[PDB]
Amino acid sequence: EAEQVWKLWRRVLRDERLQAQLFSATDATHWLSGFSESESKILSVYAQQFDRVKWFVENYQFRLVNSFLNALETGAPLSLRALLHINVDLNAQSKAFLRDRQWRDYGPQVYTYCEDVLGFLAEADELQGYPEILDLMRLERESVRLYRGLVDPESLPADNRYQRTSMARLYETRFALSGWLRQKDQLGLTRLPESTEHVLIYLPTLQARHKFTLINAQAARLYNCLEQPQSAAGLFMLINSDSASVPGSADLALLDRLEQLNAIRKPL
């Protein structure tokens, strides 16, 4: 038997709970159960070693339960500390995630692993309380999407328009998450005032660790009004109530802070 159909036979085996139960329950004359001719041929090779085969499945399922935690530390490290502080049953959530996700092995794709996990935990009933922890996970999800967006990062126009860079994203919070960002020991444990805070996630250089810094409302509106590459007049007409087409009091200063934070590109 070509070994590719051997590995191809294990992934479906290692990813289906029902088919794995059929091995321990019965080995039958009528084509086993739910297995093809060649698949049964490869299976009959393990007919004597059924007990150790079950050990491999249990060991495989156990590593994916621990791959879940490493993803949460690679992306969303703060959210992991918050879940650890409030003692959410991560082993149960990891099994719930993988079973719902058909026991997928994300492998080297850790940010895709982390982004999907933060989406699963956002809908988890155990976490429907603690509203601030949900806010932290959404912020860290934007940090995950920032890393994912720098793979094949679209393209650089380098035009004469105020334009965004792929090395920054903005997340408007529902709570004052900045309190947790400074004293990480209070993650998850304390309660936060419901204040909208504009947290810009950015990488100063492509090889560096991302950082969180807060920008003001006008700085956020400039970033929002640069959602698509907009001309000098377009950016100032959109944000200003007068549609004056000239930079307001704060705009030219904040557009400088945004460039220093590797968030925008000035026209040139």
């Binding site: 038997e1 150790r52 495989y60 890393y147 990062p153």
Partner: protein
């Protein structure tokens, strides 16, 4: 002459665990090598980074005092996907060059559905696999830019479709590929203890021992209910015997011992003054055997 040759012997080294450096007696015990797991310092493949920024700061401190060896485990070196799409080419080949590793180490398993310590799955010992993997090994060694060695694995069940002995697969693979070998003597002893018909003499006779650039001496791993880890999770004397035989029949470039994280436990703190001290006691013995067979 083959564009890749076995480097001059470096000496005895250990695998890198954050704990060992805290207590290891440097300035008393000469250690100039450190095995760095490339998958432990690699940044995600769905991200734009090669090395995780935290690990990059650690790498440079270690590089000053020690020579850093690269170990690739879960990179799909011998998988069915195209080599250029594997973790080895994308995130492991560049990391070894960051370490300036003298050579790289590979594992002869399939990265998917395999855990190095507890549960592994072997490569099919067949003629098609000798051809398929050596073509990948030759191509991967060219990309790495340094001698690539493949580590023999310990398996509890043999892959269906076996056509040859494990040593002959490794022997025919390295001849066709031109790559080298990283011998985990514990895995040979484990297979001899558990697997039926495993001939330790045939394994060492069949192998091209002149292609062994590195050796792996490891304490007893801890698999649940396996007879291994018999007295303690330290390098067993049968493994020590193969180390002497390996140096009596060939000259490797280096030997690596491993902390292996959690391995042995006791009701008292530990069944010695320090198993961490046993690490000292094992390194000294390996240094003696190395110097006893020093070819200068």
């Amino acid at each position: 002459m083959p564009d890749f040759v076995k480097p001059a012997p470096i000496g005895v080294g250990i695998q890198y665990n954050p704990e060992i450096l805290d207590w290891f007696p440097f300035e008393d015990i000469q250690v100039d090598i450190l095995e760095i797991l490339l998958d432990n310092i690699m940044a995600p493949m769905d991200g734009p980074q090669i090395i995780k920024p935290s690990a990059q700061a650690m790498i440079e401190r270690l590089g000053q005092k020690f020579t850093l060896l690269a170990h690739s485990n879960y990179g799909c070196d011998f998988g069915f996907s195209a080599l250029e799409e594997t973790a080895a080419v994308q995130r492991h080949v560049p990391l070894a060059k960051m370490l300036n590793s003298p050579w790289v180490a590979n594992h002869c398993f399939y990265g998917d559905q395999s855990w190095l310590d507890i549960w592994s799955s072997p490569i099919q010992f067949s003629a098609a696999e000798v051809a398929r993997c050596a073509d990948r090994a030759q191509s991967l060694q060219t990309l790495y830019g340094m001698p690539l060695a493949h580590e023999n694995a310990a398996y509890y069940l043999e892959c269906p479709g076996a056509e040859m002995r494990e040593a002959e697969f490794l022997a025919r693979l390295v001849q066709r590929s031109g790559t080298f070998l990283h011998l985990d003597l514990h895995n040979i002893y484990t297979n001899h203890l558990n697997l039926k018909g495993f001939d330790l003499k045939d394994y060492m006779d069949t192998l091209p021992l002149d292609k062994v650039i590195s050796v792996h001496l490891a304490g007893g791993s801890w698999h649940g209910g396996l007879y291994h880890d018999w007295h303690d999770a330290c390098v067993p004397e049968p493994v020590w015997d193969l180390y002497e035989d390996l140096l009596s029949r060939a000259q490797p470039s280096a030997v690596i011992l491993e902390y292996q994280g959690q391995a042995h436990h006791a009701q008292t703190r530990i069944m010695d003054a320090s198993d961490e001290s046993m690490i000292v006691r094992d390194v000294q013995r390996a240094q003696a055997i190395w110097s006893r067979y020093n070819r200068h």
